[PDB]
Design an enzyme around this catalytic site. Structure first.
Site, PDB file in Angstrom:
ATOM      1  N   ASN A  99     -64.915-141.841 -75.107  1.00 15.12           N
ATOM      2  CA  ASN A  99     -64.501-142.683 -73.981  1.00 15.12           C
ATOM      3  C   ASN A  99     -63.426-143.715 -74.397  1.00 15.12           C
ATOM      4  O   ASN A  99     -63.218-144.725 -73.718  1.00 15.12           O
ATOM      5  CB  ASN A  99     -65.649-143.333 -73.233  1.00 15.12           C
ATOM      6  CG  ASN A  99     -66.633-144.010 -74.073  1.00 15.12           C
ATOM      7  OD1 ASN A  99     -66.267-144.729 -75.008  1.00 15.12           O
ATOM      8  ND2 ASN A  99     -67.927-143.815 -73.714  1.00 15.12           N
ATOM      9  N   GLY A 141     -64.832-133.589 -69.458  1.00 18.37           N
ATOM     10  CA  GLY A 141     -65.974-134.226 -70.102  1.00 18.37           C
ATOM     11  C   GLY A 141     -67.282-134.109 -69.357  1.00 18.37           C
ATOM     12  O   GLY A 141     -67.312-133.800 -68.162  1.00 18.37           O
ATOM     13  N   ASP A 199     -71.897-148.131 -74.449  1.00 15.34           N
ATOM     14  CA  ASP A 199     -71.896-146.762 -74.966  1.00 15.34           C
ATOM     15  C   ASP A 199     -70.512-146.369 -75.470  1.00 15.34           C
ATOM     16  O   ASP A 199     -70.056-145.261 -75.186  1.00 15.34           O
ATOM     17  CB  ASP A 199     -72.392-145.754 -73.899  1.00 15.34           C
ATOM     18  CG  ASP A 199     -72.731-144.375 -74.468  1.00 15.34           C
ATOM     19  OD1 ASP A 199     -73.049-144.285 -75.700  1.00 15.34           O
ATOM     20  OD2 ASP A 199     -72.619-143.380 -73.716  1.00 15.34           O
TER      21      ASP A 199
HETATM   22  C1  LIG Z   1     -65.959-139.098 -71.097  1.00  9.84           C
HETATM   23  C2  LIG Z   1     -64.824-139.553 -70.236  1.00  9.84           C
HETATM   24  N1  LIG Z   1     -64.959-140.395 -69.251  1.00  9.84           N
HETATM   25  C3  LIG Z   1     -63.758-140.658 -68.613  1.00  9.84           C
HETATM   26  C4  LIG Z   1     -63.776-141.526 -67.399  1.00  9.84           C
HETATM   27  C5  LIG Z   1     -62.647-139.993 -69.169  1.00  9.84           C
HETATM   28  C6  LIG Z   1     -61.189-140.053 -68.958  1.00  9.84           C
HETATM   29  C7  LIG Z   1     -60.556-141.005 -68.167  1.00  9.84           C
HETATM   30  C8  LIG Z   1     -59.179-140.876 -68.087  1.00  9.84           C
HETATM   31  N2  LIG Z   1     -58.468-139.909 -68.695  1.00  9.84           N
HETATM   32  C9  LIG Z   1     -59.179-139.048 -69.436  1.00  9.84           C
HETATM   33  N3  LIG Z   1     -58.495-138.058 -70.061  1.00  9.84           N
HETATM   34  C10 LIG Z   1     -58.863-137.042 -70.971  1.00  9.84           C
HETATM   35  C11 LIG Z   1     -60.114-137.046 -71.574  1.00  9.84           C
HETATM   36  C12 LIG Z   1     -60.477-136.038 -72.445  1.00  9.84           C
HETATM   37  C13 LIG Z   1     -59.623-134.995 -72.761  1.00  9.84           C
HETATM   38  N4  LIG Z   1     -60.194-133.948 -73.648  1.00  9.84           N
HETATM   39  C14 LIG Z   1     -60.270-132.601 -73.008  1.00  9.84           C
HETATM   40  C15 LIG Z   1     -59.548-133.897 -74.992  1.00  9.84           C
HETATM   41  C16 LIG Z   1     -58.286-135.005 -72.147  1.00  9.84           C
HETATM   42  N5  LIG Z   1     -57.248-133.978 -72.348  1.00  9.84           N
HETATM   43  O1  LIG Z   1     -56.354-133.889 -71.518  1.00  9.84           O
HETATM   44  O2  LIG Z   1     -57.403-133.154 -73.230  1.00  9.84           O
HETATM   45  C17 LIG Z   1     -57.969-136.013 -71.253  1.00  9.84           C
HETATM   46  N6  LIG Z   1     -60.520-139.074 -69.586  1.00  9.84           N
HETATM   47  S1  LIG Z   1     -63.198-138.991 -70.486  1.00  9.84           S
END
Ligand SMILES: Cc1nc(C)c(-c2ccnc(Nc3ccc(N(C)C)c([N+](=O)[O-])c3)n2)s1
Length: 278
Positions: A125, A11, A120
């Site tokens: 998120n 992200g 937000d």
């Molecule tokens: C904007 C964000 N802030 C935080 C802190 C984020 C966060 C915190 C903990 N786990 C995750 N996993 C996550 C997020 C997005 C994705 N896409 C690629 C689909 C994936 N995937 O494996 O695809 C895992 N994201 S995402």
């Protein structure tokens, strides 16, 4: 940062970039947020480490080193945005939408009881796991998507309330139901006028003090309000009533997360297992 090995980018938010990474000391997989650089910020973010709940992504560590701030979060396998896109042909089953909305209100009722606002919320998120849980990630302090911004923020209120999170969550709830963003604005005024075109241009009757708000203009066009039956079909009357209370213009009339949890829409709530492709 010697203890973390980047795996891939997951992200790119307003504050920084988020990576999937591995902690070499524990073997743990984490989401690592890098902010490019405020002593008051390091203290407030450190207070967020104690804010632990099943519907909040755990903030494992805050590392301030070499003019950078790193936030280490627990890792979840998908965001709601990827799940909504994966489910675009069929829709998210209604029992799963209701479960996710109920869990997110629990997380907000918890943070809001500790005077912590997200500010937000968006599908990127909101994070999901294989067990049916959904969690709120990366709380904010006191190209950018405006789609979920509360009308009081767009009208220039600098001292807003926890009601801004309820508004954002209502927009996300509508989007899970219809498979289309409720108010997809591409500028502050387009965002505001999209809200007005659906919910009616606000006035002193429905929102006392609206005409004295910093960015309010008497020259705003006057649009009539639409019926929710047209806005979120095929959501039932309990869901449309709850959504209408989450989208009240006046932040003081807008339902709280605690009151939303007692809404009759949640009478038959269950915790289904999502169909996840990882
Ligand atoms: C904007 C964000 N802030 C935080 C802190 C984020 C966060 C915190 C903990 N786990 C995750 N996993 C996550 C997020 C997005 C994705 N896409 C690629 C689909 C994936 N995937 O494996 O695809 C895992 N994201 S995402």
């Amino acid at each position: 940062m010697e203890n973390f090995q980047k795996v891939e980018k997951i992200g790119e938010g307003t504050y920084g970039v988020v990576y999937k990474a591995r902690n070499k000391l524990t073997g743990e997989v984490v989401a690592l947020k890098k902010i490019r650089l405020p002593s008051t910020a390091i203290r407030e973010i450190s207070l967020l480490k104690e804010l632990n709940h099943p519907n909040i992504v755990k903030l494992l560590d805050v590392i301030h080193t070499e003019n950078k701030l790193y936030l280490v979060f627990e890792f979840l396998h998908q965001d709601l945005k990827k799940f909504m896109d994966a489910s675009a042909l069929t829709g998210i089953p209604l029992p799963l939408i209701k479960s996710y909305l109920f869990q997110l209100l629990q997380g907000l009722a918890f943070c809001h009881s500790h005077r912590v606002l997200h500010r937000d919320l968006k599908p990127q998120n909101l994070l999901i796991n294989t067990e049916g849980a959904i969690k709120l990630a990366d709380f904010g302090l006191a190209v950018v998507t405006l789609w979920y911004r509360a009308p009081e923020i767009l009208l220039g209120c600098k001292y807003y309330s926890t009601a801004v999170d309820i508004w954002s969550l209502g927009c996300i709830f509508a989007e899970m139901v219809t498979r289309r963003a409720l108010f997809p604005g591409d500028s502050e005024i387009d965002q505001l006028f999209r809200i007005f075109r659906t919910l009616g241009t606000p006035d002193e009757v429905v929102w006392p003090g609206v005409t004295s708000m910093p960015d309010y203009k008497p020259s705003f066009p006057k649009w009539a309000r639409q019926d929710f039956s047209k806005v979120v079909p095929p959501l039932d009357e309990d869901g449309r009533s709850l959504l209408s209370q989450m989208l009240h213009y006046d932040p003081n009339k807008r339902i709280s997360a605690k009151a939303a949890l007692a809404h009759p829409f949640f009478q038959d709530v269950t915790k289904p297992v999502p169909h996840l492709r990882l």
